[PDB]
């Protein structure tokens, strides 16, 4: 069937921090937190305030339903999983598969569907261009049982930053794509081109880590013990400088112009003060470049520090820069294609998202901006020839590029296990 | 008609790299490559890409059309097709006759005429001295076919290296034409004196394959591996030396004069260091004289090999001179007429296109330079009464030569089987 296809494709973005789902249907995907809660470590008369199905599974999941069992806990650090801190699960891991089997299952649960002609969904998924064969197989399993309890006809799964191009209808383009825990930034022409592909093992998360030690220097270190905390916190004073340097100087002699605050809990309030405006920059800057004394100063002896991690072959680099690693990129395509592929460069994902506060546009850079900057910083050559481009709505671009693909990808193609692409069925 | 034949005459080089076509009226003929990209291994959103009427045949060429698709695949190998490898398809080698049809159908199809009067265009082709029968059947038979599709009034198909001979208008000499996968050398008295061909094995392609090798000694183990990288390269730094251990000593003792770096894509730029300048003249002297301890250093161990192949009767012998060719061609004709067939060497394709940097003639060489050197070398005797001289534009000669060929070439005059001359209508 067919018209069938633009009711009935289902798309499904993994990643990091949400997990983004919803039929073709949709003009925007919903979204959901990327973690599971554990049942074990729990008071019993809230057990029984919990249905005998959910209980079965060791596991809750949802943006809500985690939400509200969060502060009668044992352990929070035990019973919370996150799968997918890196785009990739260990690959034995069990509670990190599980969770996913239930994050799958809730995702395709929030759409019944009571049509009499519904013959099962069309799933697609996208993993990260990190995602080693075994969790493609894996993710294939999951899918596989779960046409027990729901109606799927078919299911496939193309990397993320493909997704991206796809969604951006551009054959040809390298494409940088930062979420929580890294960037990954992958050429493409008209696939995926995988010995280009360059991760960094910093994303939004260097963001918070940054922001939860400023909130410490301020002397709110109650606050900063909180994640859902600094995140608001982060996406609510973050800034990205031109020149962080040019940056640094402009706010120490007008702090006034940089001093903000925000209302996280009707209660509460967090004002960054007249002394430390400035530092609202080192939140922007450390996606894009983690090299200034400044940022250093963190790393010193404070927490969670920036380091290369191996995942398949590759490498996450610690340090290096969006820009050095938008080159590296480059140099690892054929010759020959260089020229029309380092042509359009696209930023997609979270990490990227910042704005310019009205009346900052001196100093203060959006994304686009900070990375143009940076290639004209390295070189004037390539800078003058490149486009770079945020999509809009950075979180749903991944997504809406695994619906198109799931929606013509013909269903004769199946999928063959060296190929890399086509459809299964169950 | 006429003034017809001065407007609608086709031409048609074929041969291993480049196919050089066009009407008689252009000033020069359009170049395109000797390949076809196959269809059948393919991301297959991107054949939604290509017309389902190219996806009728598993085949495209273009010089652009093939250019797009490269980086949908990598390790090119087996979905790239060159026929004519060699200047002969391989008898029953059905892709590779497959690739011919769609070169044959392209090269026209680039040329509608509007003109009311067009009733059919007037072909000429091409081929190797070195092309079998059946060759000239099936070619025969290609456009017999397209007729169909097109409008084409007579075909013809004439020698290469004859076709030199017509285009430098020169009743009398020796042509040595050599391209990418050979040089073929071939005396001309008014016919092609079969008897009197020789052929080398080897071309233009080895002048890459001592680049690659050079290359990956060098470091650049990466641009190696691409053919379109060191193509470039090899057009770029390669030498012919006047001698050649006289050449390697000049450049040993002073490096600074022959260093090169040259810019492949806006990112990557290759040198060739202080230490390897002398590795220059290695490119150039190989069209002419694999005997040197230098080149053999290369064949020792290193990638595809200089050897002799054999086609129809012909051997394409693999080391040997253009010098030493050149005479044991003279050697095989009539001892009456070796006077004024030895007259006149006539330098054409590709192959022998090299320059001299300006300030070099020093110690490097052109080629009619370096063959003039190889003769007094080998018969001081011959060299005194031989004039050598080049083509200008080496690439469209053949091409010329086809359509003067085809322009006058009476109308009457059928194709007979064993005469070798004549139109075919279809
Ligand atoms: N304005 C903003 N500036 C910087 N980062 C942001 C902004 N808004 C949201 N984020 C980031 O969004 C991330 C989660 O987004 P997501 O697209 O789900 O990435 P992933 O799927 O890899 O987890 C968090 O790192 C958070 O830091
Ligand atoms: N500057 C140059 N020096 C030497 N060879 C060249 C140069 N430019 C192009 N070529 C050669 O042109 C050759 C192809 O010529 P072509 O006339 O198409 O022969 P064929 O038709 O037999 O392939 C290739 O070997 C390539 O090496």
């Not at 993994?14 to 973690?35: A, C």
């Not at 969790?135 to 991206?164: C, G, H, N, R």
């Not at 309030?269 to 007249?274: D, N, S």
């Amino acid at each position: 069937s067919d018209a069938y296809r633009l009711k009935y494709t289902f798309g499904v973005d993994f990643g990091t921090s949400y997990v983004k789902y919803g039929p073709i249907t949709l003009n925007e995907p919903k979204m959901v937190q990327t973690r599971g809660l554990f049942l074990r470590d729990l008071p019993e008369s809230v057990k029984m305030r919990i249905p005998p199905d959910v209980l079965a599974r060791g596991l809750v999941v949802g943006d809500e339903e985690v939400r509200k069992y969060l502060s009668s806990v044992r352990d929070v650090q035990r019973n919370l999983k996150y799968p997918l801190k890196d785009g990739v699960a260990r690959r034995d891991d069990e509670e990190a598969w599980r969770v996913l089997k239930e994050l799958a299952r809730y995702t395709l649960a929030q759409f019944p569907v009571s049509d009499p002609e519904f013959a099962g969904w069309l799933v697609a998924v996208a993993l990260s261009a990190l995602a080693p064969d075994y969790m493609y197989k894996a993710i294939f399993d999951i899918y596989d049982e779960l046409a027990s309890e729901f109606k799927i006809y078919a299911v496939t799964i193309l990397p993320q930053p493909l997704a991206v191009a796809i969604a951006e209808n551009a054959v040809n383009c390298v494409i940088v794509e930062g979420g929580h825990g890294n960037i990954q930034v992958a050429p493409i022409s008209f696939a995926l081109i995988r010995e280009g592909l360059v991760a960094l093992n910093r994303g939004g998360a260097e963001a918070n880590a940054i922001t939860r030690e400023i909130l410490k220097d301020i002397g709110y270190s109650d606050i900063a013990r909180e994640e859902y905390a600094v995140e608001v916190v982060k996406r609510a004073v973050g800034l990205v400088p031109r020149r962080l340097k040019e940056a640094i100087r402009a706010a120490k002699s007008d702090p006034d112009r940089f001093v903000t605050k925000v209302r996280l809990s009707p209660v509460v309030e967090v004002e960054i003060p007249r002394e430390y405006a400035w530092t609202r920059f080192l939140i922007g800057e450390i996606v894009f470049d983690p090299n200034h004394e400044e940022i250093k100063s963190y790393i010193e002896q404070s927490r969670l520090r920036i380091e290369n991690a191996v995942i398949g072959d590759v490498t996450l680099y610690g340090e290096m820069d969006v820009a050095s690693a938008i080159i590296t990129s480059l140099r690892n395509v054929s010759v020959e294609i260089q020229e029309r592929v380092a042509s359009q460069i696209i930023l997609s994902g979270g990490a990227f998202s910042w704005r310019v506060p009205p009346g900052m546009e001196d100093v203060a850079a959006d994304s686009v901006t900070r990375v143009k900057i940076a290639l004209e910083e390295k070189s004037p050559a390539l800078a003058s020839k490149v486009e770079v481009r945020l999509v809009s709505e950075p979180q749903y671009s991944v997504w809406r590029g695994a619906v198109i693909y799931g929606y013509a990808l013909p269903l004769s193609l199946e999928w063959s296990d060296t190929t890399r692409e086509g459809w299964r069925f169950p």
